[PDB]
Ligand binder design. Sequence first.
Ligand SMILES: [Mg+2]
Ligand SMILES: [Mg+2]
Ligand SMILES: [Mg+2]
Ligand SMILES: [Mg+2]
Ligand SMILES: [Mg+2]
Ligand SMILES: [Mg+2]
Ligand SMILES: [Mg+2]
Ligand SMILES: [Mg+2]
Ligand SMILES: [Mg+2]
Ligand SMILES: [Mg+2]
Ligand SMILES: [Mg+2]
Ligand SMILES: [Mg+2]
Ligand SMILES: [Mg+2]
Ligand SMILES: [Mg+2]
Ligand SMILES: [Mg+2]
Ligand SMILES: [Mg+2]
Ligand SMILES: [Mg+2]
Ligand SMILES: [Zn+2]
Ligand SMILES: [Zn+2]
Lengths: 55, 117, 49, 190, 77, 292, 86, 169
Amino acid sequence: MARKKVRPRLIAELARRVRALREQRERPRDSQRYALDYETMMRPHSGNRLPMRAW
Amino acid sequence: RAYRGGHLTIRLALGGCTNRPFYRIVAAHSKCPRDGRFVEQLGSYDPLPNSHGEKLVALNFDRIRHWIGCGAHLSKPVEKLLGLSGFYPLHPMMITNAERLRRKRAREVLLASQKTD
Amino acid sequence: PYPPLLRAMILAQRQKYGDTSTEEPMLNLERARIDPWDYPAKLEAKTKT
Amino acid sequence: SPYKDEPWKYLDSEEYQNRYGSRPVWADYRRNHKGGIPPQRTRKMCIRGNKVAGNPCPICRDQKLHVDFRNVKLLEQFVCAHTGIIFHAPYTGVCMKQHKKLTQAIQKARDHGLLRYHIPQVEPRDLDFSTTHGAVSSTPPAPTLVSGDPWYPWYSWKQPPERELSRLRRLYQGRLREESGPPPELMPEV
Amino acid sequence: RKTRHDPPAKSKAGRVATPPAVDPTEFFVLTERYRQYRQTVRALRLEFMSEVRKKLHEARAGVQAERKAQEDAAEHR
Amino acid sequence: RKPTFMDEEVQNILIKMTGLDLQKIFKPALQELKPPTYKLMTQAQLEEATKQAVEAAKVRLKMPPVLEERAPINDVLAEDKILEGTETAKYVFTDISYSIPHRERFIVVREPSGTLRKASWEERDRMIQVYFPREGRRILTPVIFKEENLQTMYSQDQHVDVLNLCVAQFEPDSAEYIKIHHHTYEDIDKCGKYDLLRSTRHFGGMAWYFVNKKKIDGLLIDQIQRDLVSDATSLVHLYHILHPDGQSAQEAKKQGAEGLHLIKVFAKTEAQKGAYIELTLQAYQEAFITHS
Amino acid sequence: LTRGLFLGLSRQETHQQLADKKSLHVVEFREECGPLPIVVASPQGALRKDPEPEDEVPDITLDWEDVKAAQGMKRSVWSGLKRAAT
Amino acid sequence: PMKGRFPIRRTLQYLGQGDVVFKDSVKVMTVNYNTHGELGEGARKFVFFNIPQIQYKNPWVQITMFKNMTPSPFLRFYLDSGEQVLVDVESKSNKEIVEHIRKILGKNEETLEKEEQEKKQLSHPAHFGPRKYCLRECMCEVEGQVPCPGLVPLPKEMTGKYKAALKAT
RNA sequence: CACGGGAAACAGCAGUGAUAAAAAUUAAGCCAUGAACGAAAGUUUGACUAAGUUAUAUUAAUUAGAGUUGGUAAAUCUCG
RNA sequence: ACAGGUUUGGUCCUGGCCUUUCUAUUAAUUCUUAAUAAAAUUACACAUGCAAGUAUCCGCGCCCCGGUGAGAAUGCCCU
Ligand SMILES: [Mg+2]
Ligand SMILES: [Mg+2]
Ligand SMILES: [Mg+2]
Ligand SMILES: [Mg+2]
Ligand SMILES: [Mg+2]
Ligand SMILES: [Mg+2]
Ligand SMILES: [Mg+2]
Ligand SMILES: [Mg+2]
Ligand SMILES: [Mg+2]
Ligand SMILES: [Mg+2]
Ligand SMILES: [Mg+2]
Ligand SMILES: [Mg+2]
Ligand SMILES: [Mg+2]
Ligand SMILES: [Mg+2]
Ligand SMILES: [Mg+2]
Ligand SMILES: [Mg+2]
Ligand SMILES: [Mg+2]
Ligand SMILES: [Zn+2]
Ligand SMILES: [Zn+2]
């Protein structure tokens, strides 16, 4: 809240902007995203493994 | 404290002392600690059977249905309690576990008359 | 049917206000319709009204 | 002590009367301590096994005194006359053990009415007493109950269609378990 | 509990959950039970939401609320 | 139109027979004391304070209700055979809502047998106590009401205190409340101890009991030896109200009986001991007429 | 201390003395006896018909100690202490 | 409290026992009085005795005094609507002023009792918790129930230790 | 503050160095409550439950040792 | 505070210091067994193990619980 001496945090804004930008620019093509390794049953992108029942 | 998300819920807080459990039925935010802050106290449930062989449950029915009416969510054990009371239909899982229990008694009956032989 | 206690509460509640009708209290499931889990959910963001 | 079963006897005896007079049992006893203000709770217990400790209490110095719920003439001394409250242990000077003993005794005694205390006038619990309301009075049994049926159709176990069972069997294949039939009606014991 | 940024264990690494044995009969029965039960309770829940609509509207814009308002205004003048 | 304990007739008769004794009504109580207060009054202000005190003592005198016994509650709300062996104990469900009257709360019980029934009376009261405790009630029924302890308390003549315990502990329409009030009345009758309840709020109780049980002997005799005959005649009057058709009440209509003569009427026709009544009436009449 | 004490106690004004100088009944209200007006002293001689002037707000010297006691601002660890009998 | 002219009016009791409670329409009460004149007397005693009582029970209402502006004593009340109540207090007694104000914008004893009734239904008897908010903490302390093992140690069977040492063997 | 930069993080449970007058298990379970996810049976959870350790505190008994003896302030004799 | 000791050859006054009560940590000396509660030098550095997954793929969860009191006169109560 408001205390009369409160400091102006600048970098708080900078990091928001920059993160949103690097998010939009590096936003993954779903071609590589859902790409799947059929031997290991493992996503390269997320490092996630698929549930046993879906094999 | 400020949270990101999560819903209103009716659950059991666990009060008690080691080996002697006790529960405060409670309407609380979901993301807050079990025994912690709550919105409103609803009832109490004492699991240990007393002098008369009763488990005491207390339900503030008016307030309970006020909150259900605001879309609060129930815990599986609160569901089981209401159902037992008859304020909700039996929870399917109560019924099923009952059946399983019956079949266990059956197979132990047969195993008993098989071992006796 | 209403569940056993709730039915009792409603019965007694209408006896108190002088409504004698013994017509059974009934719970209306028309709006309780829910789609099975297989039914696909819409990915489209909701317009707030 | 010879008295035992009849403790009250010792209070009417001539040696009691001789020893204590009409004063209370504790009137002449003084607790020994380090300064102006005594320690806020008395010595724990003044007899450990065979050893009787120092300058013993009013109650434990005279072994013929018995604390029961029964002798009111003894217990009466440890309650205020006017205020009907029990003296704290320092006031009298009894040891904590006997003070607790006393408290419990005076309790039992009041609970058998052998000793007097204040019973307030209280109203009745209810404003208007009417046995009319549904809660207390019999309800018109639901049409499910009269017949002998389960309150809902689905409390009862109903055998599934074979097409559906086979369908499941296809879905969960190899992860399957032994199919189970109807549940036994009533549950037997050991 | 762990955090978004706390790397998973090395043992848990090559492991994914193993689902339980399915008893087809009991399981079907159960699914029906749940569908019904949830229907009933959805009904009940709607019943109660309505009750709250009523009570709120009644203790806001209802009869005696207006009586209070008018009477107090008049007393005041 | 069978006369009831709350009928203005019977209320006025009993209020009258009770009597206001301001020294017994307001009696030093064993509670924690605080130093007294002093004010300076006229004769006027003193009379006013006394009259206020009297009105207060009226409220202190308000009779605890008398009710006939309540009917046992047996109602099954449901039977679920499926739950049968699932629990060893019973669940007891108490609606607790701050608005609801305690005679209207729902108290439900799931048994091990699976049936969901309404709670019995005693269970119900015990339960209400648990969740809405009010001082003077123990949940477990106190030892003092066993016959032994009760007899002990009658021998120290605490009868007032017993009645008060009882009013706090049990419920006026209960089985125990009625059992204990009647057993107590019975004991003040066996011993002739009636004056113990005199300026008590409990007087009309044994009045209404003795009228309906048709023992007025002891209470008439007592009332006359205390040199209160206005009360003895109010009492026979009451007896007549609650037994409109009976030989005494009818003969009092025939002979057109004045109060003292009314007591004579009753002495002749109905009362079990006419010897003591006539003798005491004799002694009172003669001795009083010669003294004043 | 003992001079002061005896002086003080000597100068007590009895209820009868008070009754007589004001010429009224002095009436004692116990708390345990309720509203019942115990009459302690009566003015031998002729009682007034005149009520005492009612002072809405009295002017009395107050001791800050008693006021502090009444309002629960005395927190001293030495005051509540359990002591032996008189 | 010793210092002061009428020390009893600095006591919590005296402040409590004054009864006026404004309606919620009242925001500002302004007193205007004089330091002299016989007529003004009552108003002065009002400022001396009751203003403290009043304020204490209406802590959110700005009260403001002005001395020797007008030839005559008065109160003015400023309400939320913009309405302005003007009360001429002239030869009126201290008491009469308090009563007349209580009459105009007070709260009926009915109102006050309803309010305090809504505040006393706030702490429910059947709940459990910290001594501050509740009558009981555990249910360990209700008569028929199972007692806090910190008092009466449990039968060995109900102990989890015993159950575990049983299942092990 | 965290784009960047020092640099490579237990102020999660246990542990350990250092440091301080200051010293709990590198333990067992998800059986109960809670939480996450699942349509669901259910799975996971060092939250927690039940245990381990410790005179820190209460209580209960199986347990006797400490301090003090000029006055305040209960209690002393003979030697050095 | 129900107070007590101590200024002086002595008395009174004024005025400090201390005693008597209650709790917690640590230490010394002593220590039999249970139960319950509580567990605390360190915002210094950390070996090893574990603390977040579920789920027919998407998704949804992942300092929420738990930890700590470093910082800030922060802030309490209330719009
Ligand atoms: Mg995933
Ligand atoms: Mg605990
Ligand atoms: Mg940072
Ligand atoms: Mg650690
Ligand atoms: Mg971390
Ligand atoms: Mg170390
Ligand atoms: Mg430590
Ligand atoms: Mg060590
Ligand atoms: Mg779990
Ligand atoms: Mg689980
Ligand atoms: Mg584990
Ligand atoms: Mg000097
Ligand atoms: Mg000297
Ligand atoms: Mg000094
Ligand atoms: Mg240590
Ligand atoms: Mg925290
Ligand atoms: Mg700073
Ligand atoms: Zn002793
Ligand atoms: Zn407990």
